[PDB]
Design a protein around this ligand. Structure first.
Ligand code: NA
Length: 130
């Protein structure tokens, strides 16, 4: 599923992401936008370390989900990476919360640091009623 901007902002808000561990909604939108263009079936193989990125937040298989083919990987979200490719983003949100529960917070994603950190992200939620 490829969400439309405001459609996703409201969906995230209903799943309890607004201010989760101090992270505003505009920040999660900027992250999703830059990670997959709001596409839940987005995937990326990293030939370098044999891991893969899954879903709207492009969560990696080395630490967060299990795909059975990543060397010595773990499954902190206790989910099959398949769960991160569904149109329904409930599981991806629960895992994204799990990610930010670690020391780095939203900084876990490099794209966030590159395109969202210290930037004007207000434009991502404007007009969405959130
Ligand atoms: Na894994």
């Amino acid at each position: 599923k490829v969400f439309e901007r405001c459609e996703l902002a409201r969906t995230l808000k209903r799943l309890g992401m607004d201010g989760y561990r101090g992270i505003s909604l505009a920040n999660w939108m900027c992250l999703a936008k830059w990670e997959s263009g709001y596409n839940t079936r987005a995937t990326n193989y990293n030939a370098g370390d044999r891991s893969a990125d899954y879903g709207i937040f492009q969560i990696n298989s080395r630490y967060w989900c299990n795909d059975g083919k990543t060397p010595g990987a773990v499954n902190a979200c206790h989910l099959s990476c398949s769960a991160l490719l569904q149109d329904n983003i409930a599981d991806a949100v629960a895992c994204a919360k799990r990610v930010v529960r670690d020391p780095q917070g939203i900084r876990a994603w490099v794209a966030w640091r590159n395109r969202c950190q210290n930037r004007d992200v207000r434009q991502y939620v404007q007009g969405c009623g959130v």
